[PDB]
C-alpha cells in the first residue's frame, strides 16, 4: 500500500475513504515511520522483499523489480547517478494495473511512487555520481551526445 | 624457373648475357606508359605523373597517344563491355615487347562491379603483367608497381635479333610478395590509434 504522511492521519479506515487519498485500505493493518528511518533504505527493503517474492512469470516485475532494487541500493549507498529517480518513475507508470499479469507488482510500486512523491528530497540526495554508462575503449573516439 | 612463350631452367656464352643484360637495363631504365583513360584508377595514375610524385624520376613519364610508340599498357579502369574491344584493340596495336599493368579492383578482377555491363578483370582477354589492388591505388602504389614490372623486366630472356638465336620469350617466375612480405607483415604488433592524425 503507498505511503501517506500526517495529513492523510484524520482520514476514515474505509475502502474509498483511501483509495481517494492515493492509496490502498489493504487489510487495515497500519504501520507508522518515525523521523528516524530513511525512506530510501526502507523503500530499497521493501523492494527487495517484492522483488524477491515474484514468481518470475511476467516480464516486467520479473525483470524491472530487481532494477529498482539495484537504484534504491545506489541511491542508499549514495552511487546514484543521473536518470535514477526517473528510471524508478517509469517503472512506477509502467507496472500498473493491466501491464503486468498479476496484482503483486502494482502493490510493489504503490510505495515506491508513493514515497518519490512526498519524500522526493531524500531520493535526490543519494544522486551523488555522473552517469557513466560506457568506459572508454582506446582508439574509438565515442559519439559524445548532448 | 622460368616461362617460354611451358616451364623450362635459365637458358643464360657469357657476351650474350651481359648484351641481354644491357637490353633489359635499357627496357625497365625507359617505360614509355600508354595515354589511355578509362575511370577513376586513371585519374590516380596522372595524379602520380604530376609534381608531387613525380613519376618521370624513373623515366616513365613520356606518356604517347599512339599505341605503337608505348610499351607499357596500364588498364586503370573498369573494362566495360563495349570499351573491352577497345581495349583490345589497342593492345593488339602495340608493339614487342609490351607489358600490362592492372590497376585497381575493377582491372583486376571487376571490384564492386559484378554487373551485366562490366568484364570481370582484363586478364579475361589481354595477359597482365602487374596487379595493383586498391580502390583507386595511390599514386604511390602505381610506383611500386612500375618498379615491380622494372624487376621483372629485369630478369627475363628476350632474343635480341629476329634472324638469330632462339625467338621465344623467357618470363621469370618470380616470387609473390605476399610470401616475401610475409617476414615482416606478421611481425607488426601495434599501429597508432585512428583518433590521432
Ligand atoms: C609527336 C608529338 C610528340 C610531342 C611530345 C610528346 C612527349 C612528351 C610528353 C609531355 C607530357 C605531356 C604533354 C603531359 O600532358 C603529361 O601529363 C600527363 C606528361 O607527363 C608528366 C608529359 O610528359
Ligand atoms: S507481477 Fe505477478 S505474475 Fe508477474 S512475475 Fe510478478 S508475481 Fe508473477
Ligand atoms: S577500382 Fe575503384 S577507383 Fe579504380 S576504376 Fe574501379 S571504381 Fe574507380
Request: contains cysteine.
Amino acid at each position: 500500500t503507498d505511503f501517506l504522511t500526517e495529513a492523510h492521519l484524520d482520514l476514515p479506515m474505509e475502502f474509498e475513504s483511501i483509495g481517494k487519498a492515493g492509496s490502498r485500505l489493504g487489510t487495515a493493518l497500519a504501520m507508522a515511520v518515525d523521523h528516524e528511518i530513511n525512506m530510501v533504505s526502507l523503500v530499497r527493503n521493501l523492494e527487495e522483499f517484492f522483488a524477491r517474492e515474484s514468481c518470475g512469470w511476467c516480464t516486467p516485475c520479473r525483470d524491472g523489480l530487481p532494477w529498482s532494487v539495484k537504484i534504491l541500493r545506489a541511491l542508499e549507498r549514495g552511487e546514484g547517478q543521473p536518470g535514477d529517480i526517473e528510471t524508478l518513475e517509469q517503472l512506477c507508470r509502467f507496472l500498473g494495473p493491466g501491464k503486468t499479469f498479476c496484482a503483486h507488482a502494482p502493490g510493489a510500486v504503490e510505495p515506491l511512487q508513493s514515497a518519490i512523491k512526498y519524500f522526493r528530497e531524500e531520493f535526490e540526495a543519494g544522486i551523488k555520481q555522473p552517469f557513466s554508462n560506457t568506459h572508454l575503449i582506446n582508439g574509438i573516439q565515442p559519439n559524445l551526445l548532448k | 624457373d622460368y616461362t617460354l612463350t611451358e616451364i623450362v631452367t635459365d637458358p643464360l656464352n657469357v657476351f650474350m648475357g651481359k648484351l641481354n643484360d644491357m637490353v633489359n637495363w635499357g627496357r625497365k631504365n625507359s617505360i614509355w606508359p600508354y595515354n589511355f583513360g578509362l575511370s577513376c584508377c586513371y585519374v590516380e595514375m596522372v595524379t602520380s605523373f604530376t609534381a608531387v610524385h613525380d613519376v618521370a624520376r624513373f623515366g616513365a613519364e613520356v606518356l604517347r597517344a599512339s599505341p605503337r610508340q608505348a610499351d607499357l599498357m596500364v588498364v586503370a579502369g573498369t573494362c566495360f563491355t563495349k570499351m573491352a574491344p577497345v581495349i583490345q584493340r589497342l593492345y593488339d596495336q602495340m608493339l614487342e615487347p609490351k607489358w600490362v599493368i592492372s590497376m585497381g579492383a575493377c582491372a583486376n578482377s571487376g571490384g564492386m562491379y559484378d554487373i551485366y555491363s562490366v568484364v570481370q578483370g582484363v586478364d579475361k582477354f589481354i595477359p597482365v603483367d602487374v596487379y595493383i589492388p586498391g580502390c583507386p591505388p595511390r599514386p604511390e602504389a602505381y610506383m611500386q608497381a612500375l618498379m615491380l614490372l622494372q624487376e621483372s623486366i629485369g630478369k627475363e630472356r628476350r632474343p635480341l635479333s629476329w634472324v638469330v638465336g632462339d625467338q621465344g620469350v623467357y618470363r621469370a617466375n618470380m616470387q609473390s610478395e605476399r610470401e616475401r612480405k610475409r617476414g615482416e607483415r606478421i611481425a607488426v604488433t601495434n599501429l597508432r590509434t585512428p583518433d590521432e592524425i
